[PDB]
Each structure stands twice: as structure tokens, then as C-alpha cells.
């Protein structure tokens, strides 16, 4: 009942993350940060545990999140390493700073029976 449910509503968050009303901001997180395109030469010396969407959509997929907490904690960690790596007044970070409120405002209203 309450864990098929959860699941659904983690399901259709990350299907509006994915969506082109949020794609301005979002795009940077849908694949995985590919550290030798960009140069960043120092990203897994930072990094240790790298997370981004299609990530999250394989595990989804997989049924390998139990329950809302675990897959909420894989998004934040995304945004966490986004936050750690870059600087507080870079681009990207403004577009973290954006989804994660999309995510956080649609997570909050995750069915709680
Ligand atoms: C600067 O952080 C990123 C940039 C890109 C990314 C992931 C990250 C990233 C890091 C690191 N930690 O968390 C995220 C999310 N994936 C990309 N794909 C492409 C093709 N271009 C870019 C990109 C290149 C140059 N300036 C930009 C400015 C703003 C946004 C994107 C870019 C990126």
C-alpha cells in the first residue's frame, strides 16, 4: 500500500525533473558528470559517491530504492555534489539551487499512510 504508493510519487518526481519545463535548469544533472569532456582533472579526488538523474531513472527501474527516504537521498546527494564541487556563485549552482526546489516541494508531499 503506503511503499507501491511512495515509489509512484518518486516515479512522477523525477519524470517533472526530466520534463522541458524544467530543462533549462535541469539538464546539467541528467547524465552522469563526464569529468574528462568538461576537464575537470580534480571532480573524483572531490567526489566520491557521483549520482545524477538517468542514475536515479536505472535504479528506479531496477526497484532497487525500498522506499521514498533511499531514493530522496540519492537526488540530494546529487545536488550535494553539486554544491561541494562547484563554487556558491557559479551557474550551475543557481540551476541546483532551482531544481532542488522543485524537488523538495513536490517530496514534501509524499503520501505518509
Ligand atoms: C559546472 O558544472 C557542470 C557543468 C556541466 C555538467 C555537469 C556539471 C556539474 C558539476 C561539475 N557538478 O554538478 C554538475 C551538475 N554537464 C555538462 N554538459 C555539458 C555539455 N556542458 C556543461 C557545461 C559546460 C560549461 N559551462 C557550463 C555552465 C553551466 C552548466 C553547464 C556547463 C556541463
Redesign the pocket.
Given at each position: 500500500s503506503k511503499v507501491s504508493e511512495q515509489l509512484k510519487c518518486c516515479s512522477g518526481i523525477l519524470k517533472e525533473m526530466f520534463a522541458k519545463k524544467h530543462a533549462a535548469y535541469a539538464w546539467?544533472?541528467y547524465k552522469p558528470?563526464?569529468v574528462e569532456a568538461?576537464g575537470?582533472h580534480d571532480?573524483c579526488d572531490i567526489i566520491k559517491h557521483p549520482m545524477d538523474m538517468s542514475t536515479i531513472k536505472s535504479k528506479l527501474e531496477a526497484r532497487e530504492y525500498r522506499d521514498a527516504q533511499e531514493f530522496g537521498a540519492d537526488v540530494r546527494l546529487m545536488f550535494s555534489?553539486?554544491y561541494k564541487?562547484?563554487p556558491p556563485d557559479?551557474?550551475?549552482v543557481a540551476?541546483?539551487r532551482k531544481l532542488q526546489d522543485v524537488f523538495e516541494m513536490r517530496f514534501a508531499k509524499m503520501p505518509d499512510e
Open positions: 546539467p544533472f558528470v563526464d568538461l575537470l571532480y555534489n553539486c564541487y562547484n557559479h551557474e550551475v540551476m541546483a
